[model samples]
Target: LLSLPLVGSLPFLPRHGHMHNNFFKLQKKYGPIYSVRMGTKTTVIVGHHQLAKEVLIKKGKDFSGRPQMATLDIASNNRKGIAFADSGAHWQLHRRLAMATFALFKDGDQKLEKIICQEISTLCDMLATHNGQSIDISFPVFVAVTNVISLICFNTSYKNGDPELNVIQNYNEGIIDNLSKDSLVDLVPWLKIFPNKTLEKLKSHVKIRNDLLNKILENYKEKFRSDSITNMLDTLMQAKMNSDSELLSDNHILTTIGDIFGAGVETTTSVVKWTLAFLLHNPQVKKKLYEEIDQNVGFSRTPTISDRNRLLLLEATIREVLRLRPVAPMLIPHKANVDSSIGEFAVDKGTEVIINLWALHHNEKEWHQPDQFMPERFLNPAGTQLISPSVSYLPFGAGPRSCIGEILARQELFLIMAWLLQRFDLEVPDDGQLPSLEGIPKVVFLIDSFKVKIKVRQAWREAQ
Candidate 1:
């Protein structure tokens, strides 16, 4: 491991760098498990697949703690809420409720599929408006994704000139722009005293987010219904009204919903954009995806959650996109709550463990042609089904802290992407040039803006 006695290995980090790429370079020099100091904290970086599995799975209980940092502190009010709460009864109970909230759509007689279908249809119709014109896919994709989460949160969606959405969208973007992998205040707590423009921005946006949520909650709190709960917000409001558990607080309720909205909006939006970037770069994969959709899910109907099992290629493509270009390349760093040994190395308590998802997913030992964009790599020999490569494929993370929204995110990706492919063709203009596949790594990996030429599929138009 690369380390210095005083500052650890801070000198090894790139200046204003993308942490994901920097970690990969360090892994090459220092081996898979390396030590780097973020300010004063001893951070252990895990870049290999086996080591990641060991840390995230085998030693999950010990390594499951989240490090409270400046960004998290500013965003969640010193990590006071659900998303960053330490493992305890409060965290457990909130997670349980979040899971139950997700189950409303994943299981039972729910209308989630119906809601998604309608939203995807709306997105397709919106895309149809471009009429073969070049357009930035981000805006429409963002709207569709935000609509789904909005529906989940408060049973609300935005339209043109909607004041609330306009505020939330601007604030959310501002919040994301402030968050960075290189924020050193997470390590040196004293740095907060400095002129922290990022923190100020975070504070402003969070207030706006909370105000929007609080207003919505206030509107619903007086109208809380015992028998008819419409969305997750309703469920939380109902729980607060009934449950005596200390876990059910107004602060917890707001942040949990905020967590859902904030994570759901950007992560889902960026994943779709990255997938489109990948498809543009590799037309062969896109063609195969379209053909698979054509055979299994015809023009007669848009794809649904039920069709996921049959759409193996499409499913594999989504998985590959996630594998190759995960939304969060360096997943929120997990902290060691107790003394532990990760693969014969002694790890002291409080040593931050960052699982290098980007490196693990592209490891040469674990994958053949690790740099290639081949969805067939994730498929079975028959090419008829998906065979998971292994534990290395952690798009939503692992253990108790694995993303609660995985189920929802997958459905959103599949439904919208399938609809886009089934109904229209996305291409580049003139010389057929596409944007750089290398994404601008941020709190997430976002594709640099590029316009896609849309053409309504002949078969889809004829059927219509």
Candidate 2:
């Protein structure tokens, strides 16, 4: 069927609930690599791992552009930020700066580990106050994760009821709710004239976010020093001072920090929540996780990142959760910089390319039982170590546009999960109902609010 004059494939597009699942379903009928007109945009969906590698790795430079969508434009401050910026000198400079900052944190000091453990201690104390009652740990988890990012970004942390943290959370929610990829306004540019609530809400949220960021930046500038790089803000400030060109402006600093903060909080938090939910459902796996921690790390002291290798099961479980419920199922869309061909298929310039990570992770041929929650699949036959059986698994994506926060995210997740599990035994509520595994898909895939009863481990209790 021919597409309409302006609407293109808008009429034929699947209005079915989840966009990721819908696009995944199209693979069976249309084959692995297929293109559909998303309004006036031609989007090429890559469901197979081979094609995904080609688009993201082999020919990454050719398909590295971020599409010009209205929602992304407003969020990234007109492509000034790293995540949504197009492939060019500006993007390269910011991305390199961000990587350099992260590299410093990675190898320079144990400060990052200390910061995460501090937040973990606070989180465990809060859970202890619940006294084994079933409580929705979502907000507490969110606060803890937010504090970790806050400390990293601004050298500041927040209490449980901090007004500033609440404002950040509310504005983030508003932005996520409104700035969706499927929004009609994003697809059809000319429709901006009509009274659109989504775009309006998105604009207001972005304005508040920008205002908060500006305040943080001004405060940092007042005490800025080139020699001292205390936090991420300082690193960017130092870079700005050293640069001779006028390319990296104050807004670029603000937007880059915002990108890091927003991304740092959401993805790691969601994965932790999902992991807890899965542990609640699988008591046997949970038992093994507890035993593994007890046998390896013991109740002597808090588990550190150094003990990661000994705790094989814990790592496998987190890996399984990530494989099952990826935070960004359909990763941020990549556009063709020039005319590029994916295999034999010829892709025109300006075409939108989407890597269907969900499809790849759950591919039947690659994985044994794709939908099952089997952590052992990631473990070696001897059960001495962890191993990936297939190349289909890409939890944090790959190549040039891969997540910048992957290393930080992994460290945070490992430390937070290890510390929590070491101190408490997570179980379902008295109702015996488990948290729904079906995630509420938004800008990030989030686990719905679920109650988990936290019982302090006997060894830790006795030690206390």
Candidate 3:
């Protein structure tokens, strides 16, 4: 089994967390630009800024396509999603429309904020129950995020453990994990058969997720924004309905839907989960953050986007997590279209380049103390100054393909973290053997569960 398609030692498989340790070890030896030859494929590893910019930014026109992966292709049907589509007119147009809605009804969109606040209220109430016990924070945080997404996409919320929604969410998680398979289909044609299981599951998972999205689209056939417009789906359906694909295609509408869940869901959930784990493991970081959130936003209501401006500590924590575990590990790999040079290496058209964002965030040449969780490195008066784009920090990806959801994700993460800390203090348990981010010192993972102390109040938490 370990010698399946492209398996390694006893440690580096999905079931075990040792892949984390392997990745970190290779990166430390290879510097930033190295190659991993798994079977017939040559994986170019990049761990710095100028090179990332070479592929993702500076020469983007040349290095703008994706290597075909069996699972993603099955799910996307050659469509250029914000996450994986080929760089072209369609990606530009769809991305432009997405950019339009990003700034829409923003802060003054008080109604949207109210809905999110209500969801936070629901989250606070749940965590308050655990009081001083060590609780698995992943569930409460998942409930918090998926609820906001539910509100945005459907203008509604699912009951805490709604059975149907649970199934859909469970399947969604399963598919993403399946999709992360190491593809041998890229280099050798004869070995692509390994993708049989991946393609089969992807086929079913796509159908299930689409069925749910399609049902939502049907309900909005008669109505537009005026009667009720809470999420991105409304805006997208409106664009599709009005333009009627005379300008936008139905595939675009579907791809746009996929982008929201694809680009949004897993990435956001991973960060929040990773952040809590990192904090629990490092209590000093947690204490500093709690004190900062308390001072700025206080226990008064939930922290809103407006508070992101003041809570530099929370901003720093999020930065540190992304720095530590760039959600997209290889971060949407880009392929060189025209041969070019990056420092000493010779480039060729069609050569695949993996921007090792995991490596960039920890390059000792660029950061003061790269491995440590020092959010203070990010704080400044203007707020969390991450200006040095020296390939050292590609947390959200660098150039045009930078996660368009940055503003939204930042606000949502900050609000949730601040509000959770305010409502129920989190800490590592008594056994002192908490879950460790041993491998994820490299890439983000689908969060399973986390053990943490949930407190009713800080005073009580400390008194213990």
Candidate 4:
């Protein structure tokens, strides 16, 4: 309450509102390269797309470092894996292995697609029971995405009501919710010398999370067979056991899988939810999507990864949703490893760099109607389909320290959106105005709870 002000030149202090909203306000007064001091930390918000690119891509290495946060330190056991690990041998080796890992799961795409479709089938089965009842789409979508990550990470998937899965979700919430919450220890690590209740609770929750992950990891370790690698865990364990392998250590395996859940699950879950929120609001977009799925992927079957290209509007819609409500609006903070200059602005070594993606994605300079939910912005001039977005569009981030799980996330979103649209018609409450598009910020930006009526498609039902 006493000290939260930015050192003078800036007028309003960021005591309220979502972080990105605060960043937006600050951008007007401080021009893109504004610096704010949170306790002992100096965070530089890069608002303009060009400036973001300059920091994230051009001077990437200088600014690619991840800040040491108290919560992540405990959760990841001092940056054991990719997300929080800084730029060095530790980050480099694990990142290279992580890069190589997704390739095995994505080549020709059948492997990943099959897994996604299986999870979607489970979701469809559950929704089929609702009988047009208004339901919260968040949990089903979250569980569906969670199973996808589980299968990929540990070669395991749980039943919809599996107690273990529910517990894991709780632990996931416990750890993720704390990430954006006020943790004095994160800003001042020296506070650990004293007994802080928040820090203690964070430690306790993180320990439970790590214990759960360990149980799964240990199970995989025991069940792993070199001749037949079941999943990513098996591949990592095999890598660790190699005599000449310099890439992966045991901790690398644990943290890598944990990163998949930490970085992958929650973000994908929220984006999927946000995608639904937008689709429900814009019935035209969802209707178009439903027609495209009907045309390209008939009611006889569910959509697969090979269909990702053919479903251009679906892809664009996802892009549009992400643009409007990026899962991580002000993505995880990046630290400067050394003194750097981002667009003529000298950034001191160790300064915390914030990429205000909300500002960048919606910046008038990069987008046509920056704030509108128009998927066509990502399409080609003639607007048929499949056009790559500009570098300013960084839903998955870019440069060396970009998101490691981007590929998986894209696959999950497409398959899930396709399946949902292909089988079910999401009916907005109709009780009032459409569910609010407002997102409550967390480690991942979360769409606040909203209910939608789930009605099975007539075409799909008749086909069934």
Candidate 5:
């Protein structure tokens, strides 16, 4: 409850690694819906499931605005995109447009499936070329995830060592590294007057990103047609052409695409890596996952979205990983659009609401052995179906501002995970130890880079 002049609660806030964990620790001391002063802002942290639901779902409209942080401003191109945009007509338009566009690929003609499978096939082949040697799957997984988004957004794909891929990856890394919302520059706007290396790096990286996206947009515009809508870009272009409002400009389209592309790549890639690491550490769980895949999918064909229902354990494991290590542990901080009340607590307009998803998922009151990695926790009593044991689980969040790519993300994760586990066993290398579950907190919670030996499964090898 300590507050200082200008600096506010900076002195009282945790000064260690893993801010989310420290915040969770703070929740144990202060109740779930406690407020902390960050610089001049009164930020509220919601750590319990009911409180999170109230903020995110029950009173979503009142609490749907996004904070005007420096890093988010740069990343979202000054509120031109959906994720970081404040709640208003502009945000609503883009959110609806994005949701509709993503819906087009959800269940029609298996187009999205084909795109994801192509990248998955390439990834599997790339892994096989390693010849069972130890290698870090992070970059490869990142490349594959990027290609999936690329194919979805612009109808393009990348090879393993493609220079373009490297360029894109480096720029994305620069943006991710420098765009931490927790940075001092973000909390104190006046700090921007000084020579801030972090903001400068973020601005430069965002410039590169904008330049790349603009070129892509130009090419798409040149070849765009009304009848043939191949990817997300074409759909957005078609919408723009038909719209009466001038708000849906080319810049808006580009920023929206960037939001989707960046979000899809980072969140999906992180989840896949964490799932692999957890599997590597829990060999028994991996064996059960493989057994489920083998029994349901077998070696004759690669796993598809259609087989998702049959692969219950695979689904459970993905859910478990998501629960344990949510990519956005404190989900891209929501804000109060108006004076509102979360439960009994009165929240003033402009109060930044931080939904501590990590606390909700690992809440001991809601989960059994909250810290344990048990996939069965997500299953039904009979273990026949995947059931969310509690409302505390919100991987993609809830209500209106919830992730638009939830269905697509889940499908892609299921298929990619199935394909990899089916073709190979991810083992901790002889010389290398298992990947540490501890995450490096940033814009996204990422696992530390670790190597895994990809061994071809006996059945898969013989079938080949």
Candidate 6:
């Protein structure tokens, strides 16, 4: 277990640097459980899988509320969001809406996966043109995921140009850019009101995002059966969600819908881009993964969830990707509703517990060669492989608050990547030198620019 780092004077937004040192050094020196101060924040790390299981599984009910961050208001306007909000009637209402409307990560929504295949085909076409060239793959992937979202919500898929889409797209990108910064002011509420460059950017970003989001909400609300005829938003409109005027007001509805934009967009974008990068960086893993796809999925049709059973190695690769860089690295900070004792450690009321997802992924005991990108590590001793585990990797997280978009993200990622690899080979910008992908986490990573060089494989061209 690593000892939490001895942090020096540094801005709170750069918590990743401090935490990385803590995770690497403390785990090496101290034990799995180490105490560290994140700004004035009292934080603890449960890097061990056993402890994570105990915390997230055994004592989950007590550790489910989110830490109240000042910047949360920037995302949800001091009210609520699935990611940053506390557990209560507000969260329950939105969770019910989620379970009702979209192709949820949970059961019963498997039918909506066709949307993923369609989006993948579109992504393949886009990459075909840029094959053999280095490009910032993150932005395009972000665009594709957003388009996937637009398709489900607006009943439309678009490129850069369409007027309404342009507004939405630009606003979405801007929000992601701002959220990438460590809003120290958010951690310290006093800093929020003070005008500074980051806060200024946040204010401007929120305005753009809210305006664009409101336009969509107003424009699409009960418009025409045609508009309400397709997309997940349409499904939401039609869903007879139990609404109580006394319980949830119109404001909650708007806030909840906007929550989809805030929590659902960039999180999916980050995960997918990271997956692509890992695949490109590790050729053997990519080759074996593709072989599994080719043998089980074949080139005739795009990969689907149903194919997940047949393509065990492909699933392993995805899981490995999740382990290497679980989108959040740290799970959504959970606040205790009351005093909670996780294992023997007693946390008082309102104690902030950060689930170090990256640490759990790299647990030396549970996983062999945890630091290396070896998808084969997951293969069973008897040569069988399984995708989902009861614990360990926490990309979608766990318990009541796990991301609702996991299903949508998974479907889109698998289909788009399958057909894409079938079409072209992904490479780095410089010939042999690997690009430095070490993203400095400012609260969340901005992905400065994850540029990749793409060159079309001759075999793919010849096949056509």
Q: What is the lDDT of residue 407 in candidate 2?
A: 80
* Comparison by TM-score, 1 against 2, better one: 2
The most accurate candidate by lDDT is 2
lDDT of 2 by residue, 359-444 (tens): 99889999999989999998998889889799997888888899989888888889988999889878888999898887777778
Model 6 — which ten-residue stretch has the worst lDDT? 180-189
Compute the lDDT of residue 11 as modeled in candidate 1. 42
Candidate 4 backbone clash number: 0
**lDDT to native, each model:** 0.78, 0.83, 0.66, 0.76, 0.82, 0.64
Q: Candidate 2 has which clashing residue pairs, if any?
A: none
Candidate 5: residue pairs that collide: none
Residue-wise lDDT of candidate 6 within 1-464, one digit each (tens)?
99788656432343445354346456777776755554666665666777777667778778778776645667666656456668887787667766666734234443566556666666667777886677776656666776666665666677554576555657666665565454221233345556667556767777876776677777765574633334555544554243345434445555666777555567667666767777767888777765666666565555666876777776677777777766677766777777877668887777777677777777666676877877776677554666343356677777777778777767666666666666667776676656445654544443445667777766556655
Candidate 3 TM-score to native = 0.82
**What TM-score against the true fold does each predicted structure earn?**
0.92, 0.93, 0.82, 0.90, 0.93, 0.84
Minimum summed lDDT over a 10-residue window in model 3 is located at 182-191
Residue 137 CA error for candidate 1 (Å)? 2.0
Candidate 4 positional error at 416, Å? 0.8
lDDT by residue (78-125, candidate 5, tens digit) is 888898889887888888877766656756664789778888898898
**Better candidate by lDDT, 4 or 5:** 5
**Runs in model 4 with CA error above 4 Å?**
1-10, 38-40, 107-110, 182-196, 243-252, 380-383, 388-391
**RMSD in angstroms, all models?**
3.2, 2.8, 5.4, 3.8, 2.8, 5.0
What lDDT does model 6 reach? 0.64
lDDT of 3 by residue, 335-358 (tens): 666777565687776667777666
Error of 4 at 115 (Å): 1.1
CA shift at 355, candidate 3, in angstroms? Answer: 0.3
